[PDB]
């Protein structure tokens, strides 16, 4: 069944972006999903998103723009040090200018460049550009 809940969320908002919809619906809403979309919120990759808290696992209606190229997800959550993060963005991002690898660390959920300030590392969720 639905093993990875973030994965079926990211590919859902990726298909609607390729087709070109204005706002897509995601069936589950976890803590990891909101901490993912808000990473794309700050970089200006999706429009203003809002969730609906029902008395079950929530749903989300994100707002889309024409900016996102792809928001794929890495599976499973691999261990990522700091001596190999540049060995991950070497083969997972288009170029050194744009594109991000969101990764979870003990500080929280943030992109790969934010972790260079805090010098910390952790598991990897996905990536968008």
């Amino acid at each position: 069944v639905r093993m990875n809940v973030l994965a079926d969320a990211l590919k859902s908002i990726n298909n609607a972006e390729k087709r070109g919809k204005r706002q897509v619906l995601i069936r589950p809403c976890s803590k990891v999903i909101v901490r993912f979309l808000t990473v794309m919120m700050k970089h200006g990759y999706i429009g203003e998103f809002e969730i609906i808290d029902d008395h079950r696992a929530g749903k989300i209606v994100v707002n889309l723009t024409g900016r996102l190229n792809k928001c794929g997800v890495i599976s499973p959550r691999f261990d990522v040090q700091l001596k190999d993060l540049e060995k991950w963005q070497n083969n997972l991002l288009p170029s050194r200018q744009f594109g991000f690898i969101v990764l979870t660390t003990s500080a929280g959920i943030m992109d790969h460049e934010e972790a260079r300030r805090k010098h910390t590392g952790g598991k990897i969720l996905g990536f968008f550009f």
Partner: protein, 83 residues
């Protein structure tokens, strides 16, 4: 059609979407305040009762189960209410 207002759907079609496929999953069943002419008291029965209920004092059957909505016995008076 790309732009749809998924936030605030229109209630003429919201009643069309499935009970689990609504934006907030809500049932399509209800209750009502029934009374048979074979009595005068007021009871409350489901709309999909799936079991037979008689009145007090063995007066007259109140509903009959079906595959969907419970068939309200004819001649009876009822008033659909909610919470």
């Amino acid at each position: 059609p790309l732009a749809k207002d998924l936030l605030h759907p229109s209630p003429e079609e919201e009643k069309r979407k499935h009970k689990k496929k609504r934006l907030v999953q809500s049932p399509n069943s209800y209750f009502m305040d029934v009374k048979c002419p074979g009595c005068y008291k007021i009871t409350t029965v489901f709309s999909h009762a799936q079991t037979v209920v008689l009145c007090v004092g063995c007066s007259t059957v109140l509903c009959q189960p079906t595959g969907g909505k419970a068939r309200l016995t004819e001649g009876c008076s009822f008033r659909r209410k909610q919470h």
